[PDB]
Design a binder for these strands. Structure first.
Lengths: 476, 50, 50, 50, 48
DNA sequence: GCCTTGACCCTCCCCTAAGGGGAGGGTTTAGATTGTGTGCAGTCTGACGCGGCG
């Protein structure tokens, strides 16, 4: 189509963004219903893992003795007072204790779905719900890379048929009777394989703890993890359908922030991040349109990024808000008084001390480019008028070397002991100076004798016999 | 003058008028010799030939 | 420096905590002061000359 | 006959009118809000762009 | 006379010593240039 | 002169009780709003190279 005719990233963004038609009032409701359907689907899948609801039950047991409050674990109930939640946790507890004692296998496979759809009633907070899902995630991910290294324990031995190797591995999972038929195959590969049949043992039996740790076996929670992925990827592509359809809301908001130190695309990217938060935190059951909430989050993200990354030397958000308040107060006083308000009267229009306002006024200036043309000459820039102030003048370098030579003369006009006491007492010809105790430990002498030595040496160097070379280094 | 019309009216008849004198800017003044004192230095704005 | 430390421990003429930042006549300029103007920010006390 | 003297009072008016459109886009943006009954015209004029 | 930062002070103290001899190094602006080309993702070097 | 030696002495860092004050960081804001606009610059010519394009 129009592809290839522009390189501007903002034209490309707008062109690619406009291919998504907006949502109606009932479109947002459908998409939010799909999102919550995905998250309750992953809820009802993880309810198949019973240690999850035991964790939530012992969390309520923590709420029993005020380890937490109720608002931290449950945000509501669909089918907020502590009145209902007591019988709610009784409902989940009664289902758990009736599901515990049953071991069978079609007899014990409806009780789990009863558990899941009694647990569906809980509108969990993101904290606990995230905790359970990433917990079961890391559990089967470690045992799953364990299964994957059981497979690639054959690749170190040989290259092997996996399509013949998948028919064996599943379902026994407590023994090597699936591995016993591998030598009934006896193609060359399955020679090498069996010699590592010992170092697979500690792998192939250790998931046998989880075979009784969750109460389930690995193929059941395998399908549970698969339906977990289906549910969360269902919610993820539904949040994406609500983010992509409100990308013009971001632009309508972000055009109001344009020249405040950020490029247009920086603003709409930060607004996009805020919009993704707004989608994550939207409740359609409040009966409000998506624009009313999403505007709050988009405004937050955009103004926060302007506060953070629009200035070269960054000032905090508290000082950003103080500067904004000062500028608004000042443009009101300028309109009233008909002139610029002096910081003294600006200190009574605001209610801050006057030197605080003076330093706030000193803060706000932005650094000048060192390439600004001076007088718009464009052959003379600001940066070539800036001198290096850290250098020392070569007259001062010549003076320092002359002073070193003079000090060497004067200190050679002393005895070795006094010259050593002075060369250690100050840092002369050394990398460090020393205390009286360190110089005394160098001479196995207590500190006051070193002090006396150094005093008499300073007395000698003060004389008119040795000090006319040195006194010339003190400017009169 | 800020004129506020009405909500339902065949013309949008005046609901209110708020008339006041707003300060907008300071404009520099040519001295009696054709110069401007801008930041204390005297500047001449040169005629352009376009 | 260590040597400047010794030089000042000999004669005792201590360093000053202020640095001379005076305004001086540029080199080769020779003239008469004909006017002095002192501008003080409001809040700074004026010296005898202001 | 094809070149024209544009002079101080015309360039200054051009710049003033640029400042005026800068302020009038903002006062169009502010007039379409719903606080419309209790604001005076000097509460929606920004002298600093002009 | 211009860029050598270690050579300009040696030249100063050499003139004051009465020894009109230079110990020239690399101009500092050449080092600035090398660092401004290496910041372009281009490895410019000095082969010993 | 070479040392010691106990007695002083200085500066500096941290501590007191019960909070005050501020800096600098996090967080949520639920009527509903859903495509950037400068009243921009555009105004430099000539040589050269390369690539769509008939």
């Amino acid at each position: 189509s129009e592809i290839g005719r522009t390189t501007d990233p903002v034209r490309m963004y707008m062109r690619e963004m406009g291919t998504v038609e907006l949502l109606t009032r009932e479109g947002e409701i459908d998409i939010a219903k799909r999102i919550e359907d995905g998250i309750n689907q992953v809820q009802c899948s993880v309810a198949e893992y019973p240690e999850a609801i035991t964790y939530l039950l012992e969390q309520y047991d923590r709420v029993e003795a005020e380890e937490a409050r109720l608002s931290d674990l449950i945000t509501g109930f669909v089918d907020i007072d502590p009145e209902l939640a007591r019988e709610k946790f009784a409902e989940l507890r009664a289902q758990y204790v009736v599901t515990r004692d049953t071991i069978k296998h079609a007899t014990a496979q409806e009780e789990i779905l009863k558990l899941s759809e009694v647990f569906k009633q809980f509108r969990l907070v993101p904290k606990q719900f995230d905790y359970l899902v990433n917990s079961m995630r890391v559990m089967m991910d470690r045992v799953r890379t364990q299964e994957r290294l059981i497979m690639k324990l054959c690749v170190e031995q040989c290259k092997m048929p996996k399509k013949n190797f998948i028919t064996l591995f599943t379902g026994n999972e407590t023994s090597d009777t699936w591995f016993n038929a591998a030598i009934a195959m006896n193609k060359p590969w399955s020679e090498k394989l069996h010699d590592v049949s010992e170092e697979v043992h500690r792998a192939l039996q250790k998931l046998q703890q989880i075979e009784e740790e969750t109460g389930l076996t690995i193929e059941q929670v395998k399908d549970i993890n698969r339906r977990m992925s289906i549910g969360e990827a269902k919610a993820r592509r539904a949040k994406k359908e609500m983010v992509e359809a409100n990308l013009r809301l971001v632009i309508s908001i972000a055009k109001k922030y344009t020249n405040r130190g950020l490029q247009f695309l920086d603003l709409i990217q930060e607004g996009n991040i805020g919009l993704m938060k707004a989608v994550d935190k939207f409740e359609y059951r409040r009966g409000y349109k998506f624009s009313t909430y999403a505007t709050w989050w988009i405004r937050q993200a955009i103004t926060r990024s302007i506060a953070d990354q629009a200035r070269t030397i960054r000032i905090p958000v508290h000082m950003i808000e103080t500067i904004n308040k000062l500028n608004r107060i000042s443009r009101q006083m300028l309109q009233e008084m008909g002139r610029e308000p002096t910081p003294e009267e600006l200190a009574e229009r605001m209610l801050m001390p006057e030197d605080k306002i003076r330093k706030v006024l000193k803060i706000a200036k932005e650094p000048i480019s060192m390439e600004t043309p001076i007088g718009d000459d464009e052959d003379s820039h600001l940066g070539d008028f800036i001198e290096d102030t850290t250098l020392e003048l070569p007259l001062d370098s010549a003076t320092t070397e002359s002073l070193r030579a003079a000090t060497h003369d004067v200190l050679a006009g002393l005895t070795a002991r006094e010259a050593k006491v002075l060369r250690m007492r100050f840092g002369i010809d050394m990398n460090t100076d020393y205390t009286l105790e360190e110089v005394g430990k160098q001479f196995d002498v207590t500190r006051e004798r070193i002090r006396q030595i150094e005093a008499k040496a300073l007395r000698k160097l003060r004389h008119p016999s040795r000090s006319e070379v040195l006194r010339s280094f003190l400017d009169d | 003058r800020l004129v506020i019309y009405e909500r339902e009216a065949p013309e949008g008849t005046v609901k209110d008028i708020k008339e006041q004198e707003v300060y907008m800017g300071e404009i520099p003044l040519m001295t009696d010799n054709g110069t401007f004192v801008i930041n204390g230095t005297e500047r001449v704005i040169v005629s352009q030939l376009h | 420096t260590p040597e400047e430390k010794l030089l000042r421990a000999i004669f005792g003429e201590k360093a000053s905590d202020v640095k001379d930042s005076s305004l001086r006549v540029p080199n080769g300029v020779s003239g008469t002061v004909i006017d002095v103007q002192v501008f003080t920010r409001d809040g700074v006390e004026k010296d005898k000359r202001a | 006959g094809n070149r024209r003297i544009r002079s101080v009072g015309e360039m200054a008016e051009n710049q003033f009118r640029v400042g005026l459109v800068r302020v009038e886009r903002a006062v169009k943006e502010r007039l379409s809000l719903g606080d419309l009954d209790t604001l005076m015209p000097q509460d929606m004029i920004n002298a600093k762009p002009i | 006379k211009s860029d050598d930062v270690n050579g300009r002070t040696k030249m100063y103290k050499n003139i004051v010593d009465g020894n009109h001899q230079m110990e020239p190094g690399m101009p500092e602006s050449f080092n600035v240039l090398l660092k401004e080309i290496r910041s372009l993702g281009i490895n410019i070097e000095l082969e010993d």
